[PDB]
Point group: C5
């Protein structure tokens, strides 16, 4: 009865936000995405092509007024899960991938009654890295920047919560140990366009384990 | 003729369950769900010590139960269950937590739904995950482990469960390159710094060595 | 004229799928016989570092639904047609010991005849569990893989073979591996847990390095 | 003027697709002639450990349907148009001895002309069964692969070649293998599957390693 | 206010996509000019065993349609919008000597501007026919690959470059190969068979092993 209600309520909530009622951010309605990285593994550094492969996940966070509901209208539901395909999601792309990104996790996001969204895709990424000096104590340094591919800083702004990449889940028996890992926001201009584009540069210092 | 009668019943039941109500939204804290997991290990195919990746083929038995999938067989010609495509129904988002490649489905994706509302789903899969196979060529063998759990639901929404903690090795390829010394599956609760909700996984530990 | 036969087809095809209720698959009450047969074209690869062997073959499948029947006279003497394999029901026949997902090498089109039978012959490359030790000896290597329904018992889908000899008439003459024998044997088994028989077809292949 | 030329095409295409019975394919009552021709671009790779060879080539397919005829005058003198291959019926021409799925290198777009003829030219990378022995000799290696309909017999699809010579006028001049000769020839054949004969176009390629 | 912009952009796309039948593509009578430009990011791999070289670049494509024009005054001063590439017409620009299907590295969203212009910048990994002989010398290797429409001629689609100098400003400083020169050149092709011309852009890159 009451469970059939919660189920009934939640079914209703979704139907109101999705099926009854977002073309993306505009310059009069810009959006801020908070990015954060949890590096899990450096699986492979290839010195013959200069490609390194990382497994990691990407915390993405944003807020949309058109996803706001009063819990009192809906049996006091505070949040729900939904297929990422049921909502709009940012096009956060790596700028120096050498291969299509591979998805290791379900495409499900959590929507909270204030309109805030959290999406945490796990992925394997091949990207441009010269791993020379990885077999030394100084290690090798590599970098890759992530941003929206089609939206300028007038439509999508990026930010971090910490400038420190989360290394708490890093694979303890990886071939590569992590010396340091930062995530830093940047504003850049490219020659196609007059407008700034925003990225978050992920810099990693790593070396062989011993 | 009587056969055409029983198809009618099954058709009628499947259209009643699937086309009648807005489909199940997934579990909530008000309406939690217990999912039982079990692993049957077929083969360790590859152990790469240059990247520290290992590849498993296995069956992942998932069963759970919904009150929206219940029916009285007295109203549907004594039908007690049916096979259906896994895309027709809600399924749990049980994910490996330390995979390195996308998981490859080796089998059809067909569930069995029973009149009490229980669903059983057993996909066969190839998984690559993080495994330092150091010790595999020794007699004491190598030991790797991988956790499985919901990717987006906490312990307040999805509770995991096992029926046993012993992993089924009765179908393990007899001529695998690796023999299995032991395989276990064990439920675990952990809290995380970000969040006061508890979180639940089934850690799958495997010891193996080069078969010789 | 030829335009009418064109039109009876999209009627016949409308009558069968769109208009009627969907086939829910076989039941214990309405079992289905599926006839299975393999044409082996090539053993492409045998990897003794992972114990995986790669085969390329065609798999002939045949079954019959009363729900796919029509009177030719009622549709302009159309006795059969072609249709996309996804527009109809197909049996969930699977290799039980593959290591990679099957790769389809042929179009997914079946032929449906007026008596209600279906023929469907996908070409595939399969990687399955096989120790090739002895493949470089005169006596060779032996590998075996079973096929059968993943979720249907013998009381719902009855597997069958026309013959227990695999067709080697299209086997690649200049392959790396020479075929000594290739059988496809039907097996029926019972399990203490369960009241129904479980059927599968065991593809057993004896082969060696050619020369 | 541009809106005008645009309106005629949108109208021409709409009459053909949206307002008409789709063509289901050839019958014995209404057989179809598909014509094939190959343009070999490259032999990328020859693997003598598996006996697989990799080719890059585009395959010219043409056929004619009354279903697709139109008077150019009723349509602003439009004599042809380009359209997505999914909007129309295409033949199921298949390599008979591929060892991998075919990889498509070009847009899936065909050209339709007012007499109803259709020209579809897909570029492909094919892996197929080929023993490259003798490729390091002056006489070279020889391989062969048949292309034909997978589900239609020689009474439903009649396969032809405008010519027996494969077009080698775009063959990569700095390829690892030079072509000694390449033919495309219609054969008729039987299969145990089915009572009726099937038609294919056999592509026999003769090639060796390039040396200066 | 922000709800208005959302609504304004929605009505715009509604009026642009639904009032009229999508652009059916260019014709002899309504030809389109497409501008191309390459930003070469990295030569990742030069295989001398297969003579294939792998590039990663992004390819700027630009065109203008009268049917994508609007007055920003009528639409909340929206000067441009982002939209999925499946919602509009895009050109079939293909690499003519690819050995592998192109791998897409960027989202497939275009930017439509109020004057009717479209900018679409797909980032790709391309494998193509190239003899890397000389890459370990001082003179280096040279490779070439043409880009153009697969199905249109110069009568329907014309190509253009803004410059003939490939943008090397995002080239990977620690790549295995250093770029000696990179050009992008519009070319016209005349064939005995055919009155229509054919336009391509010819990407020529000179490079060598980095020291
Ligand atoms: C179920 O089977 C029992 C025993 O054969 C029979 O009496 C009963 O009528 C059946 N009920 C239905 C609804 O078919
Ligand atoms: C409209 O938006 C454009 C684009 O940024 C801006 O430059 C211009 O000033 C705006 N016009 C008005 C009247 O605000
Ligand atoms: N009964 C539904 C799933 C069964 C899947 C399975 O483990 C299996 C394995 C081997 C043969 N048949 C079935
Ligand atoms: N209809 C297909 C034309 C494309 C073939 C082509 O232009 C070509 C020819 C030679 C080298 N590179 C490309
Ligand atoms: C518009 C359309 N597609 C890509 C971009 C760009 N985005 C990222 C790099 C700068 C150029 C802009
Ligand atoms: C019917 C269905 N599927 C494939 C075929 C055949 N076509 C190719 C090989 C010969 C038989 C017939």
């Amino acid at each position: 009865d009451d469970k059939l209600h919660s189920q009934a309520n939640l079914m209703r909530l979704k139907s109101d936000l999705f099926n009854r009622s977002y073309p993306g951010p505009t310059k009069d309605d810009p959006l801020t995405v908070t990015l954060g990285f949890t590096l899990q593994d450096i699986v492979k550094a290839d010195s013959s092509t200069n490609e390194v492969d990382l497994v990691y996940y990407e915390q993405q966070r944003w807020k949309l007024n058109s996803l706001m509901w009063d819990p009192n209208e809906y049996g006091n539901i505070t949040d729900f899960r939904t297929s990422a395909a049921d909502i709009w999601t940012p096009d956060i792309t790596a700028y120096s991938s050498t291969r299509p990104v591979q998805v290791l996790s379900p495409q499900i996001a959590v929507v909270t009654h204030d309109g805030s969204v959290m999406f945490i895709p796990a992925q394997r990424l091949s990207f441009m890295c010269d791993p020379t000096g990885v077999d030394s104590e100084e290690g090798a340094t590599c970098a890759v920047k992530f941003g929206s591919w089609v939206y300028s800083g007038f439509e999508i702004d990026l930010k971090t919560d910490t400038d420190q990449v989360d290394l708490s889940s890093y694979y303890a028996s990886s071939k590569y140990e992590i010396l340091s890992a930062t995530q830093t926001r940047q504003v850049q201009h490219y020659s196609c366009c007059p407008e700034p584009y925003i990225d978050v540069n992920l810099v990693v210092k790593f070396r062989e384990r011993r």
